[PDB]
Amino acid sequence: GPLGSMKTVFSPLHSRRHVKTELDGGLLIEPHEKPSRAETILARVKDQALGEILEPEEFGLGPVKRVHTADYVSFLETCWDEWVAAGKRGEAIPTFWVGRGMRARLPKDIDGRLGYYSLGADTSISDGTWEAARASANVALTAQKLVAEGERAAFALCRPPGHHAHADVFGGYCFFNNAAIAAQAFRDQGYGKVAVLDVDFHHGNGTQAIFYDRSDVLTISLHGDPDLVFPHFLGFEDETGEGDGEAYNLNIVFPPDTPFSIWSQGLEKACERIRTFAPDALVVALGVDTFEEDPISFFKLTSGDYLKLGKRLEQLGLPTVFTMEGGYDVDAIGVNAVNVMQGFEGKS
Amino acid sequence: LGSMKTVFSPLHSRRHVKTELDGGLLIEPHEKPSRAETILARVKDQALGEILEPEEFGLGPVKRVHTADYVSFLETCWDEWVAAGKRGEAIPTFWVGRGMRARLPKDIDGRLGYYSLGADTSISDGTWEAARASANVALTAQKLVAEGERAAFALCRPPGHHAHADVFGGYCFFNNAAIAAQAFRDQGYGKVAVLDVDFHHGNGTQAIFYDRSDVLTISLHGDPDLVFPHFLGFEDETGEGDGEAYNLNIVFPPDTPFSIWSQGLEKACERIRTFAPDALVVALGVDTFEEDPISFFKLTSGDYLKLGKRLEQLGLPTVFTMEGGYDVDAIGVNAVNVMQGFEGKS
């Protein structure tokens, strides 16, 4: 496509995930991660003529299982059917989990397995969750293929998001780690080193965990202080990797009310870390829940700041896949996410 | 025929939560105040023995079992929850998933998950007061036995046996049975056995004494592959370190009746005989009952008389702590039948 354009991959199958309940503050509420998020971004991609929009190819479970365990993939496929067959009347929500002092032992019971495979209770599973998660991973893999076959960049309009999912744990509205799947696909195709930069408001705990003992995939996240927000139990600045991965994970933490003038100092530190890592490809886990009107987050970026973010990311000079993560003010989510892509393409 | 004293606190009614997460829905809680009131009414109706209010022992004996940080959390959780703007009862949303750090966070939601093993045990106003009262009920029962009674009935509510040193869940906050067992040890009883006949595994009691040989922990329960607590309670868990061979789990499948369950009871009694303890704590649940709404054994009301009789034959100073049992219209008959069987009713 012409200079100033970027392709977007989008699957209509995201609408197969449309849960009705989310545990929040002790109540079952309307979920934050709703289908209109993807539809609003897509409409803005079309309205601004960002570039070609294409549906994903089907890559099968192979590339997903380069990152996720077979038992976990099997669990996600059967969980809903087993839940209904066991007589439960609500959506599939964990009630019990492996508390501190208990065994990490897989039980037969579906409630037990729900808790074994989860890190939170705000991510209901229902009919179509499996199909939407599969399509979202294929969206990311199709974007990776576009870039591997010649595009400078591509936008993977993933829903559900991915960066909170571990090799065998779901939560934070995520099931398959689309960013990690794209990064591993780059590695499997002969890209020697890959960086994953997580600019979503929340820590990419799943991505950090998946590559934690590796030096061939650099993981960086900017996020709200986990002492104060999800995911609470990872994301601290003292987590720098393990074994061969020591010095190849970087967390940058910010307090409530942080604006772009401060957040972008952390962005500059992340970009300098990417420069010294010198990767062959970049995956950006993009959330716009850093926005000043986001209902669940406490940074203060403006819509115009997303143009600046995209410009700065283009200056890294790397083949780049963007995977859509969070962002919950639906009025502005399309403007904000597409502003990143437009800034990358030279707008403003 | 014989008499047994019962300790009961009216402060149990301070815990009266409205919601329990169950099957993806917020339902009426199973662990409800009428459980304790129905048992107490039957204790009075049968003239089992004197009924006493608990003494206030303070937090010393509780902190012999539970960590100071956990005890502090339980006192402030509800106030912090309300001040943070939450509109429901206090229920964990996130926890330490496999692969995350066991690191205590500042946030109240984060601490709720750190200190819990499940989301079915809502916290609200008065939970702290009722949990403190329930531990005092167990400690008063232990005092009665140490001062000469053969046995005493601690009519605890909330129950206790699923609580670890620093984890609440399964309707439990303080491990009343563990607190009573440790009180026996602290008063010079060299060996103590804790026998858990509740339908569910006493995972908290197991964890608290797991590396210890001075407190023998035995539980009969439904197979954790199939029921709470799922991640402890298996027969291969026999202890750790010096505690090796001082934990015994006996597991049964759905539909198990007393004629089979009592064979496991006999194996537990033989292990207790060779251990030869100086005191016995029985974590007593009657959710082994054939009509219990969340459990799958098939004991009848008359079987609880036989259970009480068999426990008396151990010949030990015995504290009964009330745990589960959720078929309310039979809970009084069932629980008091254990005490009356202990005293000689058949």
Ligand SMILES: [K+]
């Ligand atoms: K982030």
Ligand SMILES: [K+]
């Ligand atoms: K790494």
Ligand SMILES: [K+]
């Ligand atoms: K038991």
Ligand SMILES: [K+]
């Ligand atoms: K033990």
Ligand SMILES: [Mg+2]
């Ligand atoms: Mg179950």
Ligand SMILES: [Mg+2]
């Ligand atoms: Mg919070």
Ligand SMILES: [Mg+2]
């Ligand atoms: Mg009944």
Ligand SMILES: [Zn+2]
């Ligand atoms: Zn986010």
Ligand SMILES: [Zn+2]
């Ligand atoms: Zn029970």
